[PDB]
Amino acid sequence: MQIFVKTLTGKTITLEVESSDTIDNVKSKIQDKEGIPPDQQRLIFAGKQLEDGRTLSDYNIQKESTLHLVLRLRG
């Protein structure tokens, strides 16, 4: 399937993924397309932050899903 990720800078990135794809695989795709390390990627979908070791299907990510990419908090 296809998903869209919108960054804090307003940039929209289209990713060709699957519901069975792991969060690590999508983070690797994001790193390949943008250079952002997977550890530094903070993806939010439907108010839930994606965590490493899980899959998109665990977060009910479906066709043409929109995710939000945020940065680390400070305090």
Binding site: V70, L73, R74, G75
Partner: protein
């Protein structure tokens, strides 16, 4: 924009109340609000009532309101004086956010403390080490103060 927005927020809160969290101006002033939050039933603070003081900066909605607790709460992410280290009120604030969203975020925080910001390092360490002891301490504090 700093007064019509506040009137709109108050009117919205006056139409469909959350039935748990309430907010309203204190006396006759539209820049100082009192809020009441009910303790979530799925968290150790269950059965308690907490008070918040909200100050709207004159740059509203471009700058987030300042929310401070009033009743003492044994929480890793709430300082003793009453400050709250919440991202929605510090860095990830946008004009679209209303005051009801802040209350919902705080009511959610009262159930899932964030250990990545140990505002009280001792209590956060206790939470990350002995969950049962932390819950017992939180319930004891709620009984002592919130009741």
């Amino acid at each position: 924009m700093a007064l019509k927005r506040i009137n709109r927020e108050l009117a919205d809160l006056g139409k469909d109340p959350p039935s748990s969290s309430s907010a309203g101006p204190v006396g006759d002033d539209l820049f100082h609000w009192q809020a009441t939050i009910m303790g979530p039933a799925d968290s150790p603070y269950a059965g308690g009532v907490f008070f918040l003081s909200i100050h709207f900066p004159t740059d509203y909605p471009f700058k987030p309101p300042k929310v401070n607790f009033t009743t003492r709460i044994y929480h890793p992410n709430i300082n003793s004086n009453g400050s709250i280290c919440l991202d929605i009120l510090r860095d990830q604030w946008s004009p679209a956010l209303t005051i009801s969203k802040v209350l919902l975020s705080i009511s959610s925080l009262l159930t899932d403390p964030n250990p990545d910001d140990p505002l009280v390092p001792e209590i956060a360490h206790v939470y990350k080490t002995d969950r049962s002891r932390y819950e017992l301490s939180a319930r004891e504090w709620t009984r002592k103060y919130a009741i």
